[PDB]
Design a binder for this molecule. Structure first.
Ligand SMILES: Cc1cc2nc3c(=O)[nH]c(=O)nc-3n(C[C@H](O)[C@H](O)[C@H](O)COP(=O)(O)OP(=O)(O)OC[C@H]3O[C@@H](n4cnc5c(N)ncnc54)[C@H](O)[C@@H]3O)c2cc1C
Ligand SMILES: [Cl-]
Length: 488
């Protein structure tokens, strides 16, 4: 008989899951498995992103149960767990979605070796990206493109992505009964308290395939908005209704299929001929994700500066003081502190909000290494993606892909163009809620009598600015210019 395992790591969904469809074909029993490490926080990760993962597992649990099955959350390391379950469950096939991350390549190579020793077939379809990224590299002469223009030119020569896979059957082969490793008390989805977190999550975005498909439909309620979408023209200060789709954490964990997203965009584009084109269009935003996945997977040390052949070697500063202020939302610039507060409370910010805090910390004002700011983003973001966090930090620090270091965002004027009353600032910085709009972006300039009336004395209830942007930006621009010549 055929007994199969469908191993979830990413791709936490039932729709467009060819690994799940292969595991179900002719199978007597299917074991849907996610492997959890209960010594993780005993080593980093915020409760916001970890609870997002737990909610996504609870959604899969309810989906498998509605189909007569059950999700199995196995504790331990896959190298130790899978050899045990292969013999206990009589496994003949193991299926999981391909993953191009560095740790995944080393982990999956070991499990593939263990499956071969136990006579288990391994099926690893590609479904996290739009295309087989290795095929895109092979079709471009054996190397990845380093510009969005050349990459968009390649995918148009390749053609459309594969269509999304069909839905799984309405009834699934359940896991076998009375199997000791599949006991319900040891395979259940844990809460955020049981894993060791103390403070509760504060984000407003709930995990799961159900939420992802609901938010996908909500975005497609207005086909004109989708068709004319232009990323640079979107409002970073909108928080009651964000200006972009906010599908990033669902695409990160695989709660939503990029191939399904893409297929729904093409349905709309065929009916709106004046639709926006890449790179600013919504399809172009998926292509940004595909571009960085393709470059990073084929580039060694993509997340670091040393040994990264695409990243410029800049003599970034070792300033723990400046980093702490940026990390703790106490820079003295309300626009920057408000965004850093949205980071630790929501785990998500608009792309141009991320631009402001990243430029400020790196090539704009503080001259702290982009790896340091990434580490802070890797902790709090709920859409934290290995390759995407990297390339955008190297972009904003002007270490790769981007080189216009004379373009420096002002931590005062940038948000004032979108939100002159400071609506966004008052929401995430309630200490400045009574400050008149004329000073809310520059509270140190307000008369003391205005500061006392508004109940916000600079240096007592809100800190003075850590740097003079005019002086700090001039120094940073000169150091970047001198670094671009010694790089040759
Ligand atoms: C310093 C910095 C760090 C970032 N780190 C991450 C990260 O860890 N994870 C992450 O998903 N994105 C990251 N981004 C990219 C981008 O800001 C987010 O993808 C975007 O804010 C998500 O919002 P959305 O889903 O509403 O995007 P939309 O504009 O609605 O785009 C749809 C999808 O396209 C993809 N996408 C959009 N913009 C980009 C981009 N610039 N690069 C790559 N893919 C993109 C995402 O999958 C996104 O969900 C980072 C950007 C910066 C400047
Ligand atoms: Cl600006």
């Amino acid at each position: 008989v055929k007994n199969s395992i469908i191993w979830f790591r990413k791709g936490l969904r039932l729709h467009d899951n060819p690994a799940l469809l292969e595991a179900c074909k002719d199978a007597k029993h299917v074991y849907p498995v996610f492997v959890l490490d209960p010594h993780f926080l005993q080593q980093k990760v915020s409760v916001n992103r970890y609870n997002f993962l737990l909610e996504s597992l609870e959604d899969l649990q309810r989906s498998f149960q509605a189909r007569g099955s059950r999700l199995l959350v196995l504790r331990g390391k896959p190298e130790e767990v899978f050899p045990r379950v292969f013999r206990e469950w009589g496994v003949t096939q193991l299926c999981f979605e391909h993953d191009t991350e560095p740790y995944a390549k080393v982990r999956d190579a070991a499990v593939r070796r263990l499956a071969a020793e136990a006579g288990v077939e391994v099926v690893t379809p590609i479904s996290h990206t739009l295309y087989d990224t290795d095929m895109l590299v092979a079709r471009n002469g054996g190397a990845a493109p380093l510009t969005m223009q050349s990459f968009t030119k390649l995918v148009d020569r390749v053609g459309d992505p594969p269509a999304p896979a069909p839905d799984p059957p309405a009834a699934m082969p359940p896991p076998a009964e009375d199997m000791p490793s599949a006991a319900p008390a040891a395979t259940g989805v844990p809460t955020w308290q049981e894993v060791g977190f103390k403070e509760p999550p504060l984000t407003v975005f709930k995990g799961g395939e159900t939420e992802a498909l609901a938010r996908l439909e909500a975005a497609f309620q207005d086909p004109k908005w989708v068709a004319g979408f232009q990323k640079p023209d979107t409002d970073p200060s909108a928080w009651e209704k964000p200006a972009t789709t906010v599908l990033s954490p669902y695409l990160k964990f695989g709660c939503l299929s990029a191939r399904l997203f893409h297929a729904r965009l093409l349905e709309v584009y065929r009916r709106h001929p004046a639709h926006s084109q890449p790179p600013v269009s919504l399809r172009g935003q998926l292509l940004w994700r595909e571009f960085f996945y393709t470059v990073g997977s084929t580039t060694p040390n993509f997340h670091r500066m040393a040994g990264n052949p695409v990243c410029k070697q800049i003599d970034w500063d070792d300033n723990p003081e400046f980093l702490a202020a940026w990390r703790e939302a106490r820079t003295g610039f309300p626009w920057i502190d408000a965004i850093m507060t949205q980071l630790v409370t929501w785990g998500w910010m608009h792309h141009l909000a991320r631009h402001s805090v990243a430029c400020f910390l790196t090539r704009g004002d503080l001259y702290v290494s982009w790896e340091r700011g990434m580490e802070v983003f890797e902790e709090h973001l709920i859409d934290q993606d290995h390759y995407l966090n990297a390339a955008n930090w190297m972009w904003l620090s002007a270490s790769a892909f981007f080189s216009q270091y004379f373009r420096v965002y002002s931590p005062v004027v940038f948000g004032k163009k979108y939100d002159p009353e400071g609506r966004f600032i008052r929401k995430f910085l309630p200490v400045l809620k009574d400050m008149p709009a004329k000073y809310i972006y520059e509270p140190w300039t307000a008369p003391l009598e205005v500061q006392r009336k508004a109940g916000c004395v600079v240096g007592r209830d809100y800190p003075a600015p850590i740097v003079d942007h005019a002086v700090a930006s001039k120094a940073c621009i000169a150091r970047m210019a001198a670094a671009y010549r010694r790089s040759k």
